[PDB]
Amino acid sequence: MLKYIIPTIMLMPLTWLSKNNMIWVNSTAHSLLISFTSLLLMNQFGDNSLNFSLLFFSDSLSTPLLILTMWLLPLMLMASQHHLSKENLTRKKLFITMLISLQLFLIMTFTAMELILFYILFEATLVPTLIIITRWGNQTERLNAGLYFLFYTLAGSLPLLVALIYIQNTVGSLNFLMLQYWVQPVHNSWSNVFMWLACMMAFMVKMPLYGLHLWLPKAHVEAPIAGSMVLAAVLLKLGGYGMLRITLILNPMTDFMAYPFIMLSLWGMIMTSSICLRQTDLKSLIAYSSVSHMALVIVAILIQTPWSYMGATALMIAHGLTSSMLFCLANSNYERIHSRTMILARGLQTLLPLMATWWLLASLTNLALPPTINLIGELFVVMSTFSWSNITIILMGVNMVITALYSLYMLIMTQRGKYTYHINNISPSFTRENALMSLHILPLLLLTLNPKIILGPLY
Amino acid sequence: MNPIIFIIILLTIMLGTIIVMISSHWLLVWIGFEMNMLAIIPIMMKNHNPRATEASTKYFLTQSTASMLLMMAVIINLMFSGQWTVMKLFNPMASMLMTMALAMKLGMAPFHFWVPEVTQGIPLSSGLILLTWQKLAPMSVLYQIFPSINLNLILTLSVLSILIGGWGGLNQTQLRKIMAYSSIAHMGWMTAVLPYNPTMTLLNLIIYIIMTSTMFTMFMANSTTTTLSLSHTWNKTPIMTVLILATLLSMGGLPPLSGFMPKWMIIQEMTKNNSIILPTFMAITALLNLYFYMRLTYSTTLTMFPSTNNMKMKWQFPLMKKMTFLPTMVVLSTMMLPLTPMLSVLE
Amino acid sequence: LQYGPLAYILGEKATKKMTEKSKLITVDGNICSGKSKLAKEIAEKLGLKHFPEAGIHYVDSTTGDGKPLPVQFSGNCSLEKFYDDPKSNDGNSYRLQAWLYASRLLQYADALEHLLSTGQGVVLERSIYSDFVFLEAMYRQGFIRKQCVDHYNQVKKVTICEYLPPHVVVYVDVPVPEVQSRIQKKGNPHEMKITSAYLQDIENAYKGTFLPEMSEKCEVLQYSAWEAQDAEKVVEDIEYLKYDKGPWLDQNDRKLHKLRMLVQDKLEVLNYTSIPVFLPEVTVGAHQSDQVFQEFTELPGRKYRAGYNEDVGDKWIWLK
Amino acid sequence: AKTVLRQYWDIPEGTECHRKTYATTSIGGAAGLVVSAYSVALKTPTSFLEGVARTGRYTFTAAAIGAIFGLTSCISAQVREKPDDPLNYLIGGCAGGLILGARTRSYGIGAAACAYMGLTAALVKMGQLEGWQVFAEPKV
Amino acid sequence: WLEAILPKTISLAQMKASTLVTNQKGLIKLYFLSFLITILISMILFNFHE
Amino acid sequence: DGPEKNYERTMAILQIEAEKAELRLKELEVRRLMRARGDGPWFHYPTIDKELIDHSPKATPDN
Amino acid sequence: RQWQPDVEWAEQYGGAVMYPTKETAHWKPPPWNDVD
Ligand SMILES: CCCCCCCCCCCCCCCCCC(=O)OC[C@H](COP(=O)(O)OCCN)OC(=O)CCCCCCCCCCCCCCCCC
Ligand SMILES: CCCCCCCCCCCCO[C@@H]1O[C@H](CO)[C@@H](O[C@H]2O[C@H](CO)[C@@H](O)[C@H](O)[C@H]2O)[C@H](O)[C@H]1O
Ligand SMILES: CCCCCCCCCCCCO[C@@H]1O[C@H](CO)[C@@H](O[C@H]2O[C@H](CO)[C@@H](O)[C@H](O)[C@H]2O)[C@H](O)[C@H]1O
Ligand SMILES: CCCCCCCCCCCCO[C@@H]1O[C@H](CO)[C@@H](O[C@H]2O[C@H](CO)[C@@H](O)[C@H](O)[C@H]2O)[C@H](O)[C@H]1O
Ligand SMILES: Nc1nc2c(ncn2[C@@H]2O[C@H](COP(=O)(O)OP(=O)(O)OP(=O)(O)O)[C@@H](O)[C@H]2O)c(=O)[nH]1
Ligand SMILES: [Mg+2]
């Protein structure tokens, strides 16, 4: 993995040693070259994972997350450079440095063999993320959003630290390759119930699980655009990735320990989808949409079937590109009208025709139109939960109806109807904004022609 | 103070500590504590104001009471073993007195009341000695007598210190009181692991000393003693706010910073001994500390507080304080986690 | 060596350099009292260093290239605006007075540093001991709020206590109508808008408060406008003073070492002049403070510590 | 305090209810005295009788909480015929939690104390069943 | 359950506990008197002297 | 990388990790026995040195 | 612009304590130079 870690680190001296006005050009160009080289991780075998060394390894689960991670950095740089234009140069460079350091922690997090190494890097992502929100957020509430984000995560992660260290003492290792062979069944006892919870609750807060989700809408409403993109596209997936790995050593106890969390997720997805129909803040609506989508991922991970693990992996990738796109679309309006209220500016298709097409395409993927990878992932999860219990089709079906309703309602309210008379600073879309939207949707729709590369190890 | 006398008094403080750490005889250990206390009072009094006089008086009474209890333990030990060797004690009653005497010296709860007041009443440079160098001597004795220490007593002192230190710091705006309650909480972690692995006590002690010395040095560089005074640093020394930010997050135990290492290694040692509830409780309670470190980062670094017009005059003059070892200390305070296995040098 | 304990241990002691002519002399009076002239003559005759009255740009004159900086870096304090609109809502009046006290506080430290480092006496024109007369006059005319006076006294309380008072205080008593006549003669357009009531409050502050207080600890010499013209007589009086009052008699090498350690560190001198007392006249919000500071760092020879600025011709940076 | 806890844990579950309440009340009542002791020491009462009133106030509440916990917890095991079930103390813990809310006349505090006391009491039974150590003896 | 584990309820508890810990008279007499109570209950209630 | 290089690289990784896991488990067992029995180099708490004793004839005979 | 603390926000951290109570209502910030 050093062929990715070192060039990622080199983005820092590149940014600091760049000419004053070439910080955005240089960092964007070279982080795209890194993204290009990330496709060499596609050397995935049918039996063995790609095991580079004692420290790092890739398999079909981490590879798509790694490529999404490295593709998102240049996108976050284009998204951020406009609202940071009046910032002084040193503080712009520090902002870019926080993004670079976040990518460094993320690519190491997804490739660590040893679970304590995963834990530390998984935790290290908190620091830059918190700094980005609290330092470069816009409004007063960003200080509270930072505190909720920090302490929700730590309330879960600290018990995980105890459980992992406990596991190593008993088993002798936390290397994931070893755990695949030395794993032993978890027998029923109160000790193992709390070991199960300590192993899972940290990842559940990250997803986030319904009931532990209220931190997410606060963080998104307060974060700058790049903070929202990384939060939605990748940071939520640390919980999914962690659960996908650690469930290996929690069998068969997961058979009954999952029930309360399946009920929360199955019911939670309907409640959060219905909540989206009444949200007034556009960033808050997209944040609730993420909770609804990630509820399927939690269910898929917990029922542990080949089809659901394939569905979970595809949904994680599809949601990352879609939700990041929606935040960018919402931000482009915000950079014009300086308000997140969804009803403030209406009829925008009349004033920004092409940008209205990006809205349409983003909404179609959000409601999972076939054959988008958003549907492939959702369909696979729906198939597997039907076998788990036929009744779930009713909850899944209702959610798909409500999801279409709020996805189009968001499109109809902002893009259709009559334009707001008094708003007269709706300037034409910039090339930067159009390129930003198309760098989300084009890779997303191209993946439809070759879905296997995002279906994970169970493919 | 005459600069030559100040050096001599500082060396006497150091010599008193060294005597404690090289003595194999309880009388010489007691002499070391007496010498150390004698020389520390002048540096607490060196600015001659009523608050300094109160701090030195409260310090003298607390340390003198503890040294009397230490001598009482030594004599009880002599009665029941007929020897003076510095090691495990040979009477349970002597062990409780010596443990309580040393807890009083360290300022652990519920003998903690003096630490916030004495630290607040003395200069920053004196507080730096009080909360760092002065922990060495009592900890070095605890390192040698721990086999005879009552497990319930030492863990109770540890848990109370983590709770008291965490809760006490939430209500503080004075930087010296914040550091004092931070100290109480950190002594708790050091003594919790002492019965299981004394090496992790030393690791936590050394790392705590480095970060605490870093914070005190940065407070001295700007002559800040209050939260609001510290909130002006952004409009004078922007670099210092970044260093303060990183050090505070390290003191909060956040990965991947150096201050995570002692909490991490201590959790490991207690779990190896089938102690799960205690490490979990301690880690959660340590979030109280993380909260009021984060509050300081908000007012110092992550937001820009209002300034004053006269600050523009400060822009024209350079920072002339010594700030000795600050570049080294701050780097060790934050970037040592990749070198964690080096803790075996302490074995 | 740069002065410090090591230099002190090696013999750099104030008493080895201070003679019987190592005196701090301050000249005081009302506006347009000819104190500037008398102060200049005393220094020449006595061979002392003369310090012009510390104005808005005094700090500018001691740093960088010595030239005054634009007004934004002084906080837009304007003595001219004070006369035209003494009750302006921008809080210029107290902001000027708070700034002027800080400038005097810096100058007094520069003066004491000179005296303790070379043994040569200095002559000042007013000082931080007499600066309050303008504050009292401002308050009594309703130009500044009561809370402004409280802030001034808070700052003064924790700063003046560190420094010794002047050896000699020379007061030049010019009656207000005579001053009011001399201001008009001086032909300054804005200064001509001063009122006698403001001038009378200034005079009352000297006689009511300043002179009685300084007499307890200083040698106070008073003169009229005519008696002041005779500089030789004034210098004759100074050379025949006894010096039996004040704290200067209790000083020794030890105490003066601590005093010299303070006055040489200008940031420690100004430490409390910017206490976080959020008062509208002197409080600057974050955005304005941020961008003005950024502009300051762009001025020639101001980005880096003196000696490390290539744009002004510093050399050997890679070895300094 | 070891001895008092021993007789409580010596007795089985759901048997000799009057003995359990005596033990739990004695444990709780003592805690109220320890709390009272530091309170009067660190917050000097206005008068000698004022300190007695405060001591009784705290001690009564602590004794009442422990009394109800032992009473409610031992009846629940008796009625349900489940001696070794954590849920029994979950009922006992919340009962004592509500009493605190009453004594403090704050329905919010009662609900908060119910949960925290209820979960704490349930965890104590699981640790007893499975030998969880709080102050573990050093072994390695 | 909501009232128990709200952010507002947890935050108030620590805030209340902090004022209990920190609101002290600053008197030598009271702090040392608390030392006496601590030593007694250490031996009488917990037998730390054994 | 070819499939044989990755395959046999995996075996080298597994051997190292498996050996480390075994050594970690032994250390926990060795530490447990040394602490309980005090018959090893670890947990060797000091006792008084017998070379400090005076063996010469004393002022009185019975000792 | 991005919001930054105003005077009211700053004064939360300028008191003797952070959480005022009836018992600390009489407490006052210590002197700036520690001298009484
Ligand atoms: C490698 C293994 C170890 C891994 C652990 C992580 C180690 C990293 C922590 C190292 C210790 C902290 C030192 C960081 C160096 C900061 C220096 C810097 O980047 O510039 C500071 C900047 C410059 O200010 P100044 O020089 O005074 O004037 C600017 C005019 N050109 O000052 C400013 O302009 C102020 C800007 C406003 C404040 C912004 C605050 C947000 C950015 C904070 C970044 C640092 C956070 C450190 C936490 C760890 C990050 C992972
Ligand atoms: C802060 C309060 C300070 C008050 C100090 C008061 C002085 C204390 C004197 C302690 C000296 C006596 O201490 C006590 O002596 C007896 C006599 O053998 C010891 O012996 C006792 O305990 C052990 C237990 O196995 C055995 O020796 C024996 O069963 C029993 O008689 C105690 O273990 C010891 O703790
Ligand atoms: C929000 C969470 C708050 C903190 C929650 C903390 C839970 C901590 C659990 C406490 C420890 C478990 O509870 C403790 O277990 C041990 C067993 O090892 C019991 O030990 C006892 O049980 C048996 C019962 O026959 C007795 O004969 C004997 O006295 C002793 O062995 C204790 O009686 C019990 O109190
Ligand atoms: C699962 C483990 C979770 C661990 C969480 C980590 C502990 C964090 C401790 C924070 C405790 C103190 O947090 C503090 O709460 C109170 C809430 O009353 C806030 O206080 C605020 O609300 C109260 C009322 O609600 C107002 O009277 C007060 O004027 C206002 O400032 C403080 O601004 C905040 O600083
Ligand atoms: N508000 C205010 N004005 C001051 C202060 N010191 C000087 N000034 C003003 O600066 C102007 C000139 O100062 P002066 O020295 O007193 O008058 P001058 O004519 O130039 O000097 P002399 O005639 O020799 O005495 C006057 O209008 C003063 O009011 C001060 O501390 N506060
Ligand atoms: Mg003049």
Q: Which of C202, C213, C162 is nearest to C180 (CA)?
A: C202
What DSSP character marks residue B227? H
Residue F45, both tokens? 């708490």
Which atom of ligand 3 is nearest to D10's Cα?
Answer: 27
Cα separation, A404 vs A292, in Å, equals: 12
Q: Strand pairing of C219-223 and C168-172?
A: parallel
> CA B261, B263, B268, B272: dihedral to nearest 10 degrees?
150
The three-point CA angle E13-E18-E22 to 5° equals: 155
* Technique that determined the structure: cryo-EM
Q: What's the number of CA atoms in the CB half-sphere (13 Å) around residue C256? A: 22
Give the count of Cβ contacts less than 8 A between chain B and D.
Answer: 30
SS3 content of chain C, % helix, strand, coil (to 5): 55, 10, 40
- The Cα B59–Cα E39 span in angstroms is 20
Indicate the residue of B254, B283, B287 with minimum beta-carbon distance to A126: B254
Nearest C-alpha in C relative to G9:
C278
Contact: B275, D136; criterion CB under 8 Å: yes
Give me the helices (H) in B23-150, please: 26-44, 50-81, 92-106, 114-121, 124-128, 134-145
Residue for token pair 């500044």: C144
- How many whole angstroms separate alpha carbon C147 and alpha carbon C153? 10
Q: Does G13 touch chain A (CB under 8 A)?
A: no
Any idea which residue has 């308050």 for tokens? C139
Q: Which of E8, E14, E24, E45 to mutate to test the interface with D (most CBs of D within 10 A)?
A: E45
Backbone angles phi, psi at C55, to 5 degrees: -95, -165
CB D124 within 8 A of CB D89: yes
Q: Work out the end-to-end distance of chain D between its first and last CA atoms, rounded to an integer number of angstroms.
A: 28
Count CB neighbours of C195 within 10 A. 12
B321 touches chain F (CB under 8 A): no
What is the Cα–Cα distance from A397 to A399, expressed in whole angstroms? Answer: 5
Q: HSE of D15 in the Cβ direction (CA atoms, 13 Å)?
A: 8
Contact A405, A275 (CB under 8 A): no
Closest to A48 measured CA to CA, from F13, C190, D59, B301: F13
Of all ligands present, the nearest one to the C-alpha of B285 is: 4
State the DSSP string of F3-33: HHHHHHHHHHHHHHHHHHHHHHHHHHHHHHH
To one decimal, the resolution in angstroms is 2.3
Going by C-alpha positions, the residue among C155, C277, C265, C134 that lies closest to residue C209 is C134
Through-space distance between the first and last CA atoms of chain G, rounded to whole angstroms: 43
Q: Give the amino acid at A60.
A: S
What share of residues in chain E are helix, strand, coil (percent, to 5)? 75, 0, 25
Cα distance between residue A157 and residue A143, in whole Å: 21
CA distance C124 to C26: 5
Q: How far is residue C46's CA from residue C48's CA, in Å, rounded to a whole number?
A: 6
Q: How far is CA A14 from CA A74, B238, C89, E14, in A?
A: 14, 22, 49, 46
Please list every residue in chain E whose beta carbon sits closer than 8 Å to the beta carbon of residue B288: 14
Q: CA C140: distance to chain centroid?
A: 22
Interface membership of E18 toward G (CB under 8 Å): yes
Name residue, tokens 């194999």. B24
Q: How far apart are CA D112 and CA E1, in angstroms?
A: 8
Rounded-to-integer distance, Cα A139 and Cα E32, Å: 48
- d(CA C283, ligand 6 centre) in Å: 29
**CB < 8 Å to C275, chain G:** 32
Alpha-carbon dihedral G11, G13, G17, G19, rounded to 10 degrees: 80
Residue that the structure tokens 């990784």 belong to: F13
**From atom 16 of ligand 2, which residue's Cα is the shortest distance away?**
B91
Is residue C97 within a helix (H) or strand (E), and if so which, with residue range?
Answer: helix C92-118
Residue C171 dihedral angles phi and psi, to the nearest 5°: -110, 130
For residue A68, report the distance from its CA to the centre of ligand 1, in Å. Answer: 27
User: What SS3 state is found at C86?
Assistant: coil
Instruction: Write the single-letter amino acid at C55.
Output: G
Please judge whether D133 and B272 are an interchain contact, meaning their C-beta atoms are less than 8 angstroms apart: no
How do A57-58 and A50-51 pair as beta strands?
Answer: antiparallel
Inter-chain residue contact G30 with B306, CB threshold 8 Å: no
Q: Report whether residue A91 contacts ligand 1, using a CB cutoff of 6 Å.
A: yes
| Start-to-end Cα distance in chain C | 16
Q: Which atom of ligand 4 is nearest to the CA of E13?
A: 11
In the beta sheet, which residues pair with residue B48?
A: none
- In A200-277, the DSSP E strands lie at none
Q: Which two three-digit tokens encode residue B124? A: 């920053």
Q: Taking a C-beta distance cutoff of 8 angstroms, is the pair A48, F6 a contact?
A: yes
3-state secondary structure A205-227: HHCCCCCCCCHHHHHHHHCCHHH
Q: Chain E contacts of D1, Cβ < 8 Å?
A: 45-47
Q: Which of E12, E25, E34, E42 to mutate to test the interface with B (most CBs of B within 10 A)?
A: E42
Q: How far is C65 from D67, CA to CA, in rounded Å?
A: 82
How crowded is residue A242: how many other Cβ atoms within 10 Å of its Cβ? 24
In angstroms, what separates the C-alpha of A139 from chain F's closest C-alpha? Answer: 49
- Ramachandran assignment for A185, one of left (phi > 0), alpha (psi -120 to 50 degrees), beta (any other): beta
Q: Facing residues of C279 across strands?
A: none
CB of F26 less than 8 A from some CB of D = no
Q: How far is the CA of B94 from the centre of ligand 2 (A)?
A: 9
**Would you state the structure tokens that stand for residue B272, as one six-digit string?**
């190896």
CB A127 within 8 A of CB B254: yes
- Residue with the smallest CA separation from ligand 4 atom 4 is B287
- Which residue matches tokens 């008193």? B16
A34 residue type, one letter: I
**Structure tokens belonging to residue A430:** 């910039």
Distance from the alpha carbon of residue C31 to the mean position of ligand 5, in angstroms: 5
Side-chain-facing half-sphere of C123: CA atoms under 13 Å:
24
Which residue from A250, A144, A125 is spatially nearest to A187, judged by alpha carbons?
A: A250
Touch between chain C and chain F: 3 or more Cβ pairs under 8 Å: no
b/e code D93-120 from CB counts within 10 Å (16+ = b): bbbbbbbbbebeeeeebbbbbbbbbbbe
Does the Cβ of A101 fall within 6 Å of ligand 1? Answer: yes
Under 8 Å between Cβ of A438 and A326: no
* Bridge partners for A281 per DSSP: A341
Dig out the tokens for B61 from the structure. 């009474």
Distance between CA atoms of residues A202 and B268, nearest Å: 19
Backbone angles phi, psi at E36, to 5 degrees: -65, -45
Neighbours, chain D (3 or more CB pairs < 8 A): A, B, E, F
How distant, in Å, are the alpha carbons of B301, G19, G27 from that of G15?
20, 9, 9
Give the torsion sign (CA, A215, A220, A224, A229).
positive
Task: Find the residue in B nearest to C102 (Cα).
Answer: B310
Residue A158, chain B, CB below 8 Å: the answer is: yes
Distance CA A44, CA A454 (A): 12
Atom of ligand 1 minimally distant from the CA of B336? 3
Q: Is the peptide bond before A371 cis (omega within 30 degrees of 0)?
A: yes
Question: Is any Cβ of chain F less than 8 angstroms from the Cβ of A257?
Answer: no
Q: Give how far E1 is from chain D: nearest CA, Å.
A: 7
Contact between chains at C296 and B315 (C-beta distance less than 8 A): yes
Check residue C301 and give left, alpha or beta (phi > 0: left; psi -120 to 50: alpha). Answer: left
What do you get for the CA distance between the two ends of chain A, in Å?
A: 23
What's B244-261 look like in SS3? HHHHHHHHCCCCCCCCHH
Q: Which residues of E13-50 are buried (b: 16+ CB within 10 A; e: fewer)?
A: ebeebbbebbbbeeebebbbbbbebbbebbeeeebbbe
Q: In angstroms, what is the span from residue C123 Cα to ligand 6's centroid?
A: 13
Phi and psi torsions of G17, nearest 5°: -130, 175
The answer to whether residue B74 neighbours chain D at the CB level (below 8 Å) is no
* Nearest-angstrom CA–CA distance, A211 and B193: 36
G18–B172 C-beta distance less than 8 A: yes
Among positive and negative, which fits the CA dihedral G5, G8, G14, G19?
negative
Q: Is the CB of D131 under 6 A from ligand 3?
A: yes
The Cα–Cα gap between B116 and B171 comes to 12
H-only helix segments in C119-209: 132-140, 146-157, 176-185, 196-205
Nearest CA to ligand 4 atom 14: E11
Q: Residue for token digits 């420094």? A: C163
E strand or H helix at A57 = strand A57-58
Look at ligand 3, atom 12, and give the residue with the nearest C-alpha: D127
Judging by beta carbons within 10 Å of its beta carbon (0-12, 13-18, 19+), is residue A61 exposed, middle or buried?
buried
Biggest CA pair distance of chain D = 53
| Total residues belonging to chain B | 347
Q: G touches F (3+ CB pairs < 8 Å)? A: no
Ligand 2 pocket mutation pick from B67, B93, B111 by most atoms within 8 angstroms of CB? B93
Instruction: Count Cβ atoms within 10 A of the Cβ of residue B45 and give its class: 0-12 exposed, 13-18 middle, 19 or more buried.
Output: middle
What token pair was written down for C5?
Answer: 């304990």
Distance separating alpha carbons of residues B226 and B223, to the nearest angstrom? 9
Residues 6+ apart with CB under 8 A from A199: A160, A163, A164, A246, A249, A250
| Helix and strand totals (H; E) in chain E | 3, 0
User: Cα–Cα distance between B263 and A161 in angstroms, integer?
Assistant: 11
CB B337 within 8 Å of CB B257: yes
Rounded to the nearest 5°, which phi and psi values hold at B172?
Answer: -100, 135
Handedness of CA B102, B106, B108, B111 (dihedral sign): positive
And the tokens for B84? 């003076």
Q: Atom 20 (ligand 5): residue with closest C-alpha?
A: C32
Asked if G33 has any chain A CB less than 8 Å from its own CB, the reply is: no
What distance in angstroms lies between residue C275's CA and the mean position of ligand 6's atoms? 30
Closest CA to B282 of B297, B300, B264: B264
Q: Return the residue whose CA atom lies nearest to atom 35 of ligand 3.
A: D128
Neighbours of F (≥3 Cβ pairs closer than 8 A)?
A, B, D
Instruction: Specify which residues B308 forms β-bridges with.
Output: C283
How many angstroms separate the CA atoms of A455 and B243, rounded? 44
Do G5 and B305 lie within an 8 Å CB cutoff?
yes
Cis peptide before B110 (omega within 30 of 0): yes
C-alpha Rg value of chain E to the nearest Å? 17
Q: Which of B91, B102, B150 to mutate to test the pocket of ligand 2 (most atoms within 8 A of CB)?
A: B91
- Whether the CB of G19 is below 8 Å from some CB of chain C: the reply is no
Is residue B301 in contact with ligand 1, taking CB distance under 6 Å? yes
- C-beta atoms of B313 and C270 within 8 A: yes
Question: Tokens in use for B108?
Answer: 């652990």
Record: contact D135-B273, CB cut-off 8 A: no
Mutate to test the pocket of ligand 4, among E15, E16, E20 (most ligand atoms within 8 A of CB): E15
Supply D67's token pair.
């009394």
